[PDB]
């Protein structure tokens, strides 16, 4: 409706799960995050809006089972919210003043609060201060990450499969630095694996050595609890996004995928259902990709000119393609319904996807 655009919801986001649309009065989204069954929107006026499932208190809005409509977390209004990350049952938020907050499930210490007690309102992670300028947050299944502007990566929560790169420790309930001796520029926590990109463009992956999603050859899979270089991508890596059983990697002129693709989430065609080796998506070679996003079982790409391509599991309409079109897509497919829009932001969750797009005029 407004020229600045709208947030579009697809799938089971709880906003009656039909393709939905909302916007804010004199405010605009600047950041989107989707967890397994919930969503977060950070606005330009530095407010946080939460919606979806709240069974574990992941919305930070009290004890209600679910909240259908995007709801302002007014408890954080004294602070300038800049970023948010949604995991399976928890949410992380960072503020301009140097405070990082968490709410939701805490069974593996993913809130980073020093215990394993669940919370249903946002609590300060006292480990983080104004000394830590947060560039990025990420959150997986009972896992958490915060990346600073000067390239320090901190992770906490579950490490039972090595998914926070802390070797033989089972889990941690306090943020701990994860490093291989280089500044980090990008981090993504998938469900049971994670990855980071160094400032020199190297990709490191760690976590569950299953389904080929680490993208490492067999001789390296034993050391999956330590971050290891994906040497089979020779080009400089810019972004990584980790999903349920797949991984998506952005380089300057190519998108790589690896792991499981039984729903089409690898985008490598109708014949390739899994790969342990990183493979380039060939159908979109002609276009430059500016952003990548992973849900549990689907993938979204935004191009430099603001087109969006999706692929993978079509259930609930989460690919954002068509009202009746619920089939799986094995190649990146143009979101033709956004053709007269610039797609600006996208986040993908378990059974839903959230999109920020503004119309061409």
From Swiss-Prot:
Phenotype for residue 28 to F: Does not reduce interaction with PDE6D
Outcome reported for the amino acid change (mutating residue 90 to Q): In RP3; reduces interaction with PDE6D; decreased GEF activity towards RAB8A
Subcellular location: Cytoplasm, Cytoskeleton, Flagellum axoneme; Golgi apparatus; Cell projection, Cilium
Effect of residue 267 to S: In RP3; reduces interaction with PDE6D
Effect of mutating residue 315 to E: Abolishes interaction with RPGRIP1
RCC1 repeat placement: 46-97, 98-150, 151-200, 201-253, 254-305, 306-359
Mod. after translation: Prenylated.
Tissue: Heart, brain, placenta, lung, liver, muscle, kidney, retina, pancreas and fetal retinal pigment epithelium. Isoform 3 is found only in the retina. Colocalizes with RPGRIP1 in the outer segment of rod photoreceptors and cone outer segments.
Domain comment as written in the entry: The RCC1 repeat region mediates interactions with RPGRIP1.
Description of how the protein assembles with itself and partners: Interacts with SPATA7. Interacts with CEP290. Interacts with WHRN. Interacts with PDE6D. Interacts with RPGRIP1. Interacts with RPGRIP1L. PDE6D, RPGRIP1 and RPGRIP1L may compete for the same binding sites. Interacts with RAB37 and RAB8A (in GDP-bound forms); functions as GEF for RAB37 and RAB8A.
Described function: Acts as a guanine-nucleotide releasing factor (GEF) for RAB8A and RAB37 by promoting the conversion of inactive RAB-GDP to the active form RAB-GTP. GEF activity towards RAB8A may facilitate ciliary trafficking by modulating ciliary intracellular localization of RAB8A. GEF activity towards RAB37 maintains autophagic homeostasis and retinal function. Involved in photoreceptor integrity. May control cilia formation by regulating actin stress filaments and cell contractility. May be involved in microtubule organization and regulation of transport in primary cilia.
Disease: Retinitis pigmentosa 3: An X-linked retinal dystrophy belonging to the group of pigmentary retinopathies. Retinitis pigmentosa is characterized by retinal pigment deposits visible on fundus examination and primary loss of rod photoreceptor cells followed by secondary loss of cone photoreceptors. Patients typically have night vision blindness and loss of midperipheral visual field. As their condition progresses, they lose their far peripheral visual field and eventually central vision as well. Retinitis pigmentosa, X-linked, and sinorespiratory infections with or without deafness: A disease characterized by the association of retinitis pigmentosa with recurrent upper and lower airway infections. Some patients also develop progressive hearing loss.
Protein name: X-linked retinitis pigmentosa GTPase regulator
Residue numbers of the full-length protein present here: 8 to 369 of 1020
